[PDB]
Design a protein around this ligand. Structure first.
Ligand code: VZ1
Ligand code: ZN
Length: 257
């Protein structure tokens, strides 16, 4: 099945998932000098005060911090969005080297990693229905650069030893995702897709302009995870990013000048 290796990586995905060559695939390069300020865009509303994290899972492709999405507890609204979108999980994509790892790029610049806070439109009732809709998901993407440590990230880092291999999960309650945000909520937005199979074209992407900084030690701990299951040959979970896809008939809008 699919992965990020030479034989099962992004250039192969179209064979099982022909939408990989579709009209609204993600990620994309964000050309800052072609993105246009849209004054009708509204400030994002990130309401994470009542967030309930439950568990962290290594799924063989990344690790996901999962939340209770059976109530409006951690929601994203505003910006380009109509309606309320509930946080279901967050995860990251990262590199083997500090100069690569993000999915989106900015004027072709790759960041060391990229955080995806995944939310689904409550008008569709559940996440499985939402992924079948063109406005089903809103993913908030945040770039990571290597510099000073991000204190908000350390409790994620310190549980990774307990989920080294595919299929391992650990309790992960009371985690505050607000500690992963940068200061500014200025953003770019465009219509796209999931960046992994099944690559469904169901995402309003909201990518923050301001990266967060994490330490070299923090990202090194991401790179000690494994794509394989326990007792299978060890393959480090690194370079789990899809490269930029053609923008096609899309415009990227900026919330700022
Ligand atoms: C059963 C249960 C319960 C709860 C709370 C959470 C979860 N976790 C969950 O549903 N995760 C979504 C993983 S996926 O849909 O299968 N594919 C997906 C692909 C790429 C992106 S990306 N990289 O475009 O952001 C985002 C998602 C599951
Ligand atoms: Zn992602």
């Amino acid at each position: 099945h699919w992965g990020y290796g030479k034989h099962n990586g992004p250039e192969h995905w179209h064979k099982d998932f022909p939408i990989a060559k579709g009209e609204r695939q993600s990620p994309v390069d964000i050309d800052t000098h072609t993105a246009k300020y849209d004054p009708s865009l509204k400030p994002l509303s990130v309401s994470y005060d009542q967030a309930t994290s439950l568990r962290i899972l290594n799924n063989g492709h990344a690790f996901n911090v999962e939340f209770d999405d059976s109530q409006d507890k951690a929601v994203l609204k505003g910006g380009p969005l109509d309606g309320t979108y509930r946080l279901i999980q967050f995860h990251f994509h990262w590199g083997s080297l500090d100069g690569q790892g993000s999915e989106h790029t900015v004027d072709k610049k790759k960041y060391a990693a990229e955080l995806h806070l995944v939310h689904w439109n409550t008008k569709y009732g559940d996440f499985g229905k939402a992924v079948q809709q063109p406005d089903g998901l809103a993913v908030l993407g945040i770039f990571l650069k290597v510099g000073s440590a991000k204190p908000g990230l350390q409790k994620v880092v310190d549980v990774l030893d307990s989920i080294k291999t595919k299929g391992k999960s650990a309790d992960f309650t009371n985690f505050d995702p607000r500690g992963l945000l940068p200061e500014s909520l200025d953003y770019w937005t465009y219509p796209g897709s999931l960046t992994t199979p099944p690559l469904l074209e169901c995402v309003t992407w909201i990518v923050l302009k301001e990266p967060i900084s994490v330490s070299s030690e923090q990202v090194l701990k991401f790179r000690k995870l494994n794509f394989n299951g326990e007792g299978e040959p060890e393959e480090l979970m690194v370079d789990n990013w899809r490269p930029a896809q053609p923008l096609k008939n899309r415009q990227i809008k900026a919330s700022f000048k």
